[PDB]
Design a protein around this ligand. Sequence first.
Ligand SMILES: NC(=O)C1=CN([C@@H]2O[C@H](COP(=O)(O)OP(=O)(O)OC[C@H]3O[C@@H](n4cnc5c(N)ncnc54)[C@H](OP(=O)(O)O)[C@@H]3O)[C@@H](O)[C@H]2O)C=CC1
Ligand SMILES: CCc1nc(N)nc(N)c1-c1ccc(Cl)cc1
Length: 216
Amino acid sequence: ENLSDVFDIYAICACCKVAPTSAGTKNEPFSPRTFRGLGNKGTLPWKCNSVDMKYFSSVTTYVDESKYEKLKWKRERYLRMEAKLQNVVVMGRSSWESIPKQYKPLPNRINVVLSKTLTKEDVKEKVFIIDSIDDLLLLLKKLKYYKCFIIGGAQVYRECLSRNLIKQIYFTRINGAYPCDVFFPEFDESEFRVTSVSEVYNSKGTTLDFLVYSKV
Ligand SMILES: NC(=O)C1=CN([C@@H]2O[C@H](COP(=O)(O)OP(=O)(O)OC[C@H]3O[C@@H](n4cnc5c(N)ncnc54)[C@H](OP(=O)(O)O)[C@@H]3O)[C@@H](O)[C@H]2O)C=CC1
Ligand SMILES: CCc1nc(N)nc(N)c1-c1ccc(Cl)cc1
């Protein structure tokens, strides 16, 4: 069976173009993947993009009650053989720490932070602290939710793609070049097909679009 399908594990990210460097061995002016920039110095490479922000918020928050029973059954079945509704959002520690206190935990979604060092003692926000992907799966198996969104960062995307635990990738392309030090991990793209390509959008002069890739 495909766990990414049974537990509806999707990834959502936004990547921009990478700003060249005149020094160092990391300049890739000819990179085969134009949009691969994820972060810089612990924060996003670009300045507040309200357009992607709204998009991100809608995707990760939207739930359809009518479609849940079907998911409930699909899961009850898998679990059988193995033996307010909200989506889950999963993020690495650095990502969680990069979010300003006032915006955490992300409202209307069940928050999960992956970390082997954070403790419930110092993390007062309502969030599940998970020690590993393995434990993440243990959590989803005993949790009522709609879809599970992996929202970052690079390390977390890598682990999930590497384990073939991603069913869909919601990929925002930011058409701007900014300095970057964290990039989207490479994986076998032949395993996916683009299933949604939005019209172009504009943020203060910078264009961007939204793509969705679904596993074959
Ligand atoms: N453009 C985009 O869409 C996104 C950009 N970002 C950007 O990416 C950068 C942060 O990403 P990155 O550096 O990859 O870090 P992450 O945000 O993934 O956090 C890394 C930390 O998460 C924890 N972690 C990772 N995997 C596991 C695991 N399997 N089990 C338990 N804990 C785990 C560890 O915490 P610990 O050390 O406590 O164990 C780890 O050091 C920032 O610059 C941020 O702004 C982040 C998300 C999305
Ligand atoms: C709004 C930015 C954004 N847009 C998209 N399309 N995907 C994401 N995963 C994020 C994101 C970045 C950093 C953190 Cl910490 C959490 C989420």
